[PDB]
Amino acid sequence: QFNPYGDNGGTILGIAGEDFAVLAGDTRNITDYSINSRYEPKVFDCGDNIVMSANGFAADGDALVKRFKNSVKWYHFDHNDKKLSINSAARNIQHLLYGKRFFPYYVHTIIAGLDEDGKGAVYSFDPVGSYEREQCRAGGAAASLIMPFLDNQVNFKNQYEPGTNGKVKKPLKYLSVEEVIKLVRDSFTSATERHIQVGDGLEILIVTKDGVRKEFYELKRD
Amino acid sequence: SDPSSINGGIVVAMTGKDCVAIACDLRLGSQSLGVSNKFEKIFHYGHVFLGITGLATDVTTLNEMFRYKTNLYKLKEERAIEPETFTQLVSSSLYERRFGPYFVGPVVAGINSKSGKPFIAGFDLIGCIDEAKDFIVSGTASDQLFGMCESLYEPNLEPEDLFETISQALLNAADRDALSGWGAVVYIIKKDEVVKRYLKMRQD
Amino acid sequence: MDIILGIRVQDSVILASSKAVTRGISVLKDSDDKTRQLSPHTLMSFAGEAGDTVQFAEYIQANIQLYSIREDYELSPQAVSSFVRQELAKSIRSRRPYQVNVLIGGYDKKKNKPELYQIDYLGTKVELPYGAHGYSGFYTFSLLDHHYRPDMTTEEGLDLLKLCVQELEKRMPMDFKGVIVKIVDKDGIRQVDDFQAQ
Amino acid sequence: MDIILGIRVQDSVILASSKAVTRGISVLKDSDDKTRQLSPHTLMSFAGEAGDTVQFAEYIQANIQLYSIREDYELSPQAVSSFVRQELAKSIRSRRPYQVNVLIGGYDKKKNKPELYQIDYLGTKVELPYGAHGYSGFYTFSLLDHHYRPDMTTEEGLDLLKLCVQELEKRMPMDFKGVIVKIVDKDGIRQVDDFQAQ
Amino acid sequence: TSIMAVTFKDGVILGADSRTTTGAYIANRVTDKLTRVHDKIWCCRSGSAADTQAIADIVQYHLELYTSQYGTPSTETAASVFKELCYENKDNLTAGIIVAGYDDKNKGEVYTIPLGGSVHKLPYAIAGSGSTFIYGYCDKNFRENMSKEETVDFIKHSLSQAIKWDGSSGGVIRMVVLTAAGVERLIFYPDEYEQL
Amino acid sequence: TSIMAVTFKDGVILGADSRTTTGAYIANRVTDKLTRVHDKIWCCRSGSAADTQAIADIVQYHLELYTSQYGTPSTETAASVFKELCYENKDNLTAGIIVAGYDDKNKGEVYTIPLGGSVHKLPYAIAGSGSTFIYGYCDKNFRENMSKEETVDFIKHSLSQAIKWDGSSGGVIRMVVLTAAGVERLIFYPDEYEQL
Amino acid sequence: TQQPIVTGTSVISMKYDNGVIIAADNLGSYGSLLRFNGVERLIPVGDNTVVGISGDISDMQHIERLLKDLVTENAYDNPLADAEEALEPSYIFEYLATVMYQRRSKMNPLWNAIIVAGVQSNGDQFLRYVNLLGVTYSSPTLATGFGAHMANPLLRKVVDRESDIPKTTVQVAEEAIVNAMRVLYYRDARSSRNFSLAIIDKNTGLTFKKNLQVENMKWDFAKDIKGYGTQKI
Amino acid sequence: TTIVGVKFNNGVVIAADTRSTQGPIVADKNCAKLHRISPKIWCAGAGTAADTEAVTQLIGSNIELHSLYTSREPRVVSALQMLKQHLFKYQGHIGAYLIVAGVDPTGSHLFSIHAHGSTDVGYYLSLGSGSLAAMAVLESHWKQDLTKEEAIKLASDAIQAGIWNDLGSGSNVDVCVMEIGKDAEYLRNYLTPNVREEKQKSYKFPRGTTAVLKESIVNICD
Amino acid sequence: GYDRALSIFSPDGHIFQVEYALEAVKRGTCAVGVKGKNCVVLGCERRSTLKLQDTRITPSKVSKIDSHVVLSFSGLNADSRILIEKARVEAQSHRLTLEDPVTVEYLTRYVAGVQQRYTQSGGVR
Amino acid sequence: TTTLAFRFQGGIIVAVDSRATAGNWVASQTVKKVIEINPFLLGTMAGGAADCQFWETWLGSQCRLHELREKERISVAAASKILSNLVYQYKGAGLSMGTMICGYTRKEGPTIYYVDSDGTRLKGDIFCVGSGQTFAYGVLDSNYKWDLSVEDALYLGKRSILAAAHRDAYSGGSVNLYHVTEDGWIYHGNHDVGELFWKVKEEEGSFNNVIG
Numbered sequence A: 001q002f003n004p005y006g007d008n009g010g011t012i013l014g015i016a017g018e019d020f021a022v023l024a025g026d027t028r029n030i031t032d033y034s035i036n037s038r039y040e041p042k043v044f045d046c047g048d049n050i051v052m053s054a055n056g057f058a059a060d061g062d063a064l065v066k067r068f069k070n071s072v073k074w075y076h077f078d079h080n081d082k083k084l085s086i087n088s089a090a091r092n093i094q095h096l097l098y099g100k101r102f103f104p105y106y107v108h109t110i111i112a113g114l115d116e117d118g119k120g121a122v123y124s125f126d127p128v129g130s131y132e133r134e135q136c137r138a139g140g141a142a143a144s145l146i147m148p149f150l151d152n153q154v155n156f157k158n159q160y161e162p163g164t165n166g167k168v169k170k171p172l173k174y175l176s177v178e179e180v181i182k183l184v185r186d187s188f189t190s191a192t193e194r195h196i197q198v199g200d201g202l203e204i205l206i207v208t209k210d211g212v213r214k215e216f217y218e219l220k221r222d
Numbered sequence B: 001s002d003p004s005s006i007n008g009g010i011v012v013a014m015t016g017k018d019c020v021a022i023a024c025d026l027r028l029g030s031q032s033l034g035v036s037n038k039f040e041k042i043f044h045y046g047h048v049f050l051g052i053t054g055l056a057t058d059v060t061t062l063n064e065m066f067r068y069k070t071n072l073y074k075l076k077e078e079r080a081i082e083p084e085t086f087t088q089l090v091s092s093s094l095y096e097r098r099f100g101p102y103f104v105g106p107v108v109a110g111i112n113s114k115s116g117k118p119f120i121a122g123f124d125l126i127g128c129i130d131e132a133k134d135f136i137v138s139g140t141a142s143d144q145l146f147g148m149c150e151s152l153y154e155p156n157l158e159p160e161d162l163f164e165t166i167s168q169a170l171l172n173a174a175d176r177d178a179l180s181g182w183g184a185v186v187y188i189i190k191k192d193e194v195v196k197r198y199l200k201m202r203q204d
Numbered sequence C, D: 001m002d003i004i005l006g007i008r009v010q011d012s013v014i015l016a017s018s019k020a021v022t023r024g025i026s027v028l029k030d031s032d033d034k035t036r037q038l039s040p041h042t043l044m045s046f047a048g049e050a051g052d053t054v055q056f057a058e059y060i061q062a063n064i065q066l067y068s069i070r071e072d073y074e075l076s077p078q079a080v081s082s083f084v085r086q087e088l089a090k091s092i093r094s095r096r097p098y099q100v101n102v103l104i105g106g107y108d109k110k111k112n113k114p115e116l117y118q119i120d121y122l123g124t125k126v127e128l129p130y131g132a133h134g135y136s137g138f139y140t141f142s143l144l145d146h147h148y149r150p151d152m153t154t155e156e157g158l159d160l161l162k163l164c165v166q167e168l169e170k171r172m173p174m175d176f177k178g179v180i181v182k183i184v185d186k187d188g189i190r191q192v193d194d195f196q197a198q
Numbered sequence E, F: 001t002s003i004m005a006v007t008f009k010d011g012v013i014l015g016a017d018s019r020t021t022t023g024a025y026i027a028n029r030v031t032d033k034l035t036r037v038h039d040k041i042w043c044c045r046s047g048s049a050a051d052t053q054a055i056a057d058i059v060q061y062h063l064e065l066y067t068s069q070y071g072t073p074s075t076e077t078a079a080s081v082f083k084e085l086c087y088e089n090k091d092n093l094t095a096g097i098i099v100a101g102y103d104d105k106n107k108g109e110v111y112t113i114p115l116g117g118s119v120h121k122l123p124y125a126i127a128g129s130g131s132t133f134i135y136g137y138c139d140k141n142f143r144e145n146m147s148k149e150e151t152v153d154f155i156k157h158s159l160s161q162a163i164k165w166d167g168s169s170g171g172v173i174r175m176v177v178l179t180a181a182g183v184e185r186l187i188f189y190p191d192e193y194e195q196l
Numbered sequence G: 001t002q003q004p005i006v007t008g009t010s011v012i013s014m015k016y017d018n019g020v021i022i023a024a025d026n027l028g029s030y031g032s033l034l035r036f037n038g039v040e041r042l043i044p045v046g047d048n049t050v051v052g053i054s055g056d057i058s059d060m061q062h063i064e065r066l067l068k069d070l071v072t073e074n075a076y077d078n079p080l081a082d083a084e085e086a087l088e089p090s091y092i093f094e095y096l097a098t099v100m101y102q103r104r105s106k107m108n109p110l111w112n113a114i115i116v117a118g119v120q121s122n123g124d125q126f127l128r129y130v131n132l133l134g135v136t137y138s139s140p141t142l143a144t145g146f147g148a149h150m151a152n153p154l155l156r157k158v159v160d161r162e163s164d165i166p167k168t169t170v171q172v173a174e175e176a177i178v179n180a181m182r183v184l185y186y187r188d189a190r191s192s193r194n195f196s197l198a199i200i201d202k203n204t205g206l207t208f209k210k211n212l213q214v215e216n217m218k219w220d221f222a223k224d225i226k227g228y229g230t231q232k233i
Numbered sequence H: 001t002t003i004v005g006v007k008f009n010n011g012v013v014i015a016a017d018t019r020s021t022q023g024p025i026v027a028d029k030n031c032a033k034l035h036r037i038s039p040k041i042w043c044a045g046a047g048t049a050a051d052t053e054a055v056t057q058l059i060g061s062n063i064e065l066h067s068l069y070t071s072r073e074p075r076v077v078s079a080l081q082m083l084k085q086h087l088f089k090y091q092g093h094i095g096a097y098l099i100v101a102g103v104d105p106t107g108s109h110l111f112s113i114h115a116h117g118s119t120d121v122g123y124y125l126s127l128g129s130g131s132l133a134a135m136a137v138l139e140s141h142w143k144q145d146l147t148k149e150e151a152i153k154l155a156s157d158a159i160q161a162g163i164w165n166d167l168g169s170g171s172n173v174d175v176c177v178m179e180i181g182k183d184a185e186y187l188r189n190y191l192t193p194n195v196r197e198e199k200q201k202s203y204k205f206p207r208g209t210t211a212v213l214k215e216s217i218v219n220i221c222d
Numbered sequence I: 001g002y003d004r005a006l007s008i009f010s011p012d013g014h015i016f017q018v019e020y021a022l023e024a025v026k027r028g029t030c031a032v033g034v035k036g037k038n039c040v041v042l043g044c045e046r047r048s049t050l051k052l053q054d055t056r057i058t059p060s061k062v063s064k065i066d067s068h069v070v071l072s073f074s075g076l077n078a079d080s081r082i083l084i085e086k087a088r089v090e091a092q093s094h095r096l097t098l099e100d101p102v103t104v105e106y107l108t109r110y111v112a113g114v115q116q117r118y119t120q121s122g123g124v125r
Numbered sequence J: 001t002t003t004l005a006f007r008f009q010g011g012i013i014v015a016v017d018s019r020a021t022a023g024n025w026v027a028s029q030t031v032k033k034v035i036e037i038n039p040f041l042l043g044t045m046a047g048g049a050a051d052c053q054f055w056e057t058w059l060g061s062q063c064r065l066h067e068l069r070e071k072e073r074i075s076v077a078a079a080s081k082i083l084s085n086l087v088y089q090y091k092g093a094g095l096s097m098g099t100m101i102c103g104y105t106r107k108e109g110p111t112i113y114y115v116d117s118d119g120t121r122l123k124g125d126i127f128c129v130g131s132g133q134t135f136a137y138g139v140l141d142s143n144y145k146w147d148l149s150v151e152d153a154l155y156l157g158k159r160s161i162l163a164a165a166h167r168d169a170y171s172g173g174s175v176n177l178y179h180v181t182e183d184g185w186i187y188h189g190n191h192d193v194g195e196l197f198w199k200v201k202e203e204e205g206s207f208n209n210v211i212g
């Protein structure tokens, strides 16, 4: 019997800063035990200072990103070239996902950008539509490896002040754009070491009030 | 359905400078239901430490089996069991039940009394020896532990510094696992002394 | 499944076991004693498969009594519970396993302290201040986690089990026809005949 | 399944319906009224599938009330029961059938005689002196076959249902949390608020 | 079932056995598997008897409507109609059809249509359960531009071996010759082909 | 798999392809399917590689013990030992073995043993997945008492067609000649047999 | 939902300094039976694109018909059909990629794995993959079925990344393709010796080569191999 | 897993990767897949790792006892016959796929064994998930009458093809050379082309970060 | 099938079909309604063109929409039954979904909504 | 997932946890489980996260459309039945949801409606939905009185979640509190279970078995 779904592997990572947002993802596309591509873009700039990546089944991922980019295009036509806010984009993607509730997109989509206050925003989506604004989110194959690390290093979980006998937690002094990239790169190298579907190359898309910047880094090709 | 996912729990081992560390959570459960917060998964026979994950009935059985076998070993050899030799004893004992295996994830940790060499080892349910110089992980949050250990670990850590590494690797992995938590305990193994520390963590 | 509850207070172990025996569509008995005396100071309650539940209990009873005659000595609650665990561990990998969940309620005369052990059909032993088998814990544990103290009297322990049973009689769909309550202390094992309206 | 009982005496129809709503592991409600007034002299009790049970009952209620306004006339209990039967008969061969069992308890004002109708989810209508759905009849019918008379008073019918409920509360494993009792006669429909300890 | 069609010097000859079976019982031992869809366009039928009959009847209808409007259809056109029905309804059909016809310009042509519904133009084609046993024989003995005498002998020797080894095949060997001279029916009985 | 053994004037020749597959991947393209069980008694192997190797090793053991006590065994004796293992363990074995050996009195003999575990003495026998495609060719081209030159050509042409149509068959054509002169190993490469 | 009946095996491809090379063998397999030998599995569209299809042949012929209709449709009301408004390899792929994904979404897929090879109007190399699932990806080397497992490792030795593309000439790239076809004929049971090869160059244009055979095969070592373990003769 | 065996003019060489996986997660990044039956007969394992280790040690133990009983050097055909008959008895339930090679008084030998008990003989062989990637290189560069150094290069290149192309393989290359008149040289980590790059940040925690409830000394001495 | 635009605008800006529908109301028997402090009273006149009717069975001018709402009318008797039926269905549908009987304002809004729909739909008057 | 809503003198207390799990994997510890239908109405979330989040927000759209139409505030009975009837149309399709719709109207007072994916609609005083619902019921039933103060009722809902978060493996993260009055709901903060456990343990004396 024909199975309409597949697993293209990969892992994406989205961390929201104080006035910035990053959306990273490996460039490796796979099928079973074979590498389809060592460089296949996964994080896309959709316009209006919004970046998007739908990881899982690549055919469903490409269709959703393509349909959202078109939704942004029509939002300009219908509403006199109004900028689509990150919360408005998030709600729009829910209806795009829930529209196929009984035949879902097999993807974990994450969007990053800035809110109407200029603060960093990251939204993570369920394959069927459920969404929530989060501080940081890893999605895909090595998501279970990266997320516990982020709780410890970004949110300072299980960390206390030395000498306080575990009564005072480590203060939430938030990280700069340089510090977040360091955590992103270390997350993906650790993912490449321990997960077979992660590697080849890392591409990070940084979103600020100026626009969208792109950075590329080499990963292990084994 | 999966016998290694009924009770829950995790064990992690790490090497350092002239020292080894082994840690586990204290949770015992029945699917969603939490049963016990005192189910220790680390056991010792002389100076060799063993951490067992998986089905709790097999955890207790193997502990009693390896206590049975190390006691007879000590009477015959007139000496305590060694980490390298005990690793082979676990491997052969697990493979003896190849087609009816104990649903476990055993972890050996200790320092050789003669050479002073830090030693850790890992096993699957059928007795495959995983001898890594860095870290050994096992349990329902094995993926979470692999991600923690690969990022936090650095070679040649002091006993006081290695404690911080293994504790943070265990706690943050257990908080991302439903079947792990409910307290934690860390052993710091040295040539002369062993320090046992209970950790403060989330109770949900 | 049947209701099996246990609580260890200051000086005694209290066990509460449901009276109902249900087969298919009818309740055949509403006064069944789902417990066996293993030794003067050790009591075991049980629930599970129809036939296995009593057969296993009487098998354990016969072995402990055999030991008591041979050595002229009563085994410690720890030694009895370990024996029960090994039998269930051997059973789980046999041709046809004993599907029996047990609670060991005993008073150690040497230690002068009450002890409660919880072992399921797989052979999973755990020493607990309070224990339950099956779905019983889902309704009761939150009440036990709230009110329980280690220095509680036997009277206080009976009041907490009363609150536990009242919650079971309200939220649980099955009618278990009340419970038989037994106390295990330094003087032996006695039955609380007045729990129907305590 | 829930308890749905009906009895037709000399001058009235008495319906007894269980108060419990059980979903999976918990009893969510112990005061549920599993009945709807279709017309001033016609009452219908219901049990079955979680969602279908109330949706069908209110659908029939809306249709009978629509007829009552259009014609300024109340349909006979026979005419109502035939309408309910046909709706269940159409449903049984549809994409997703109504899994609802009903009892029609009505008093014919033209005939001056009480009437009780029993229809299952398939659409099987039968006029009975006494009726029950599911497993309810297995415990009750022998008591009804023994004590029932056509010339029984309303008070006598309440005593017989009490005996029927007592048998259900003893032998049936499910706790149905008692019953709501309603009387349908010449004066309309009233609820017996004192059946808990009658 | 053993069916084949071979192009030669003067045109094309279609050959078939006469056995249709329901399990191990022969329901018909004198079946005609060579069906006419147009004057000089014929087909060989294998697989489901119900499906192949229904397809051939629709094709004959399509080619009759084609002739009324546009004149005599080509063999490629007939093969396309067969393909259109077989490919589009592949989930419901079990049909292996060899399409062979004679043209004044294109001479003799053979198109095979397997289960999936694809077209394959070939010098000769073999199909059916019995064809598996003669893949070796036909490949070593087939020549292009054979005479009528040789082509009949080629199909007669090939199908005789197909009948001999296959239980689903048997009966008589039927042949339909398509040339400029016309349409010729040929039959060969068990007493002749079994002793070849 | 394409295996065969043909008796002739001077003895018997065994033939085989060299392809063993795990699904659609060729795990070995130079396999030797012609296994010796005694000096002048050989076997062709088809089906499960693990089964046929285990059977042949046990037969070689039995025939070695036979020779130590009773002398050189007959081809019928070797075929009987093969059958005894195949028939009694039919539920656990997937083996199609052709047994062919040379005797000074009996000349050349071929015994085929299909899946069930029966013995069939034949002038020649074909087995394996590729044999189905050459049933027609072999039946029409086989003659009794052929020369060594003719028999080699017969097997070479047969297996070439078997390899051509069957995906499970391929590689090189291996041959073992069993006569009074001794045992002769023959090999034929793709560049030769494909263009026959 | 369907099943493939008549199938085509691997389609392998790579890009060099001036264009792309794509190749596929001339076989039409019927299960284990190697039924048809005159099957062209490379479909040239215009003079700048070659489409290589593997899998179901009846579905391939449907795609072949769709591509011929696209040429006819593009030329309608278009005076620049052979100039500026000619069919680009990117237009041909995207159309097929849309069709492939729509068919799988209707639960009735075209049982194929397709590689679109060609050179764009600006001179850029185009090489993209699309299958029955609608999954699309680009790589310096692309191969379907057994080619993905065997040909890809060999072709990636010549071009490992994007910087290796301008360093690879036509002669070196074609040699790697011919060698890959030989390896596929060695180890793939559903492969043919006869194959077609297509070269799309930004300077010399489209070069379609037919009736190519696998040559220089090593088989001589087979005579030395006898038995399966202990046999000496 | 990628394992190969190459025959040269005066012996045989085997090579393997060092990646051990539990599904999509790498358990060991540097494990030994080259096992020893006897001093001059070595084995490469693929499939169930516990099965390959145990079947090598069992037959290796019996080979040692046989060698001492017969007062002769172990033979490859002996190790081969004992392995195949053991694997056949268990009908493939013992998932051991092995490439066995070695030198003895009769010469150099190379064999491959499957779980069901079938054996194959050749000059170049490959097994595992990266077998097809390895065989591709072997079919392209192999020639008759290879020298020692050429055989090491060919086997190592075949393993590399498994590392880069197959997801079930990675990390390092282990090689073992077995020459007719010399001792077998086992080259652990012959090539290390997958060295982890330095982390962007040191995650050394300040002392007193983790909260401790209770502390005690464990008694080792009896 | 039939969608001919019957109700359309005229040069002066009137819908004649709606305008002539009011003329049918002018022909219909007089109906009056008055509201007091605690009651509403509806009064209707009866025709005297033919006098031999059975007052028991003859459809009355005042119709109950629900137990609390009544409806009287002026104009074509046949057209009113359609509005009365649809109002009675809506009254029951409102009780089914909102779990509360209609307000007089809502029932009026529905009836007027139905009437408006027939003033700009094709094929209806 | 543990969600409760009880009816009392001062209105309605809505208390939920914040953990989301897929099998053994904890997806998040900070997931909202109360949908703010409007300034007056609230809806709990249990079962399928997408089914609850989509349709309860859709419910807010229908409630707003009703209030524009009728020029009057929508009752809890009417609002709950909108979702109930919609869910019943999808019955058998595979929706998974168990929700409480809470509101305080003048016509009804405080009202709780339990609506699930099977199509069950029940009005009641006390409801708990989720995998840890049984643990919540224990603490709730034994301490519930109608004459509870707003301060004590907020604590009881908070305590009931804590008990369930502790014992149920799928429940945890943080506690979200709500107090519904006639003028609207009032949000009463997010309380991390990790910090709340030790605070309650010391102040109350409960959770003796846990060592701290």
Ligand SMILES: *[C@@](O)([C@H](Cc1ccccc1)NC(C)=O)[C@@]1(C)CO1
Binding pocket: J001, J002, J019, J020, J021, J031, J032, J033, J045, J046, J047, J048, J049, J052, J130, J131, J170, J171
């Ligand atoms: C609970 O029922 C969850 C999670 C959840 C998140 C948000 C809204 C509703 C539910 N639901 C599922 C699908 O399981 C818990 C944590 C037990 O899983």
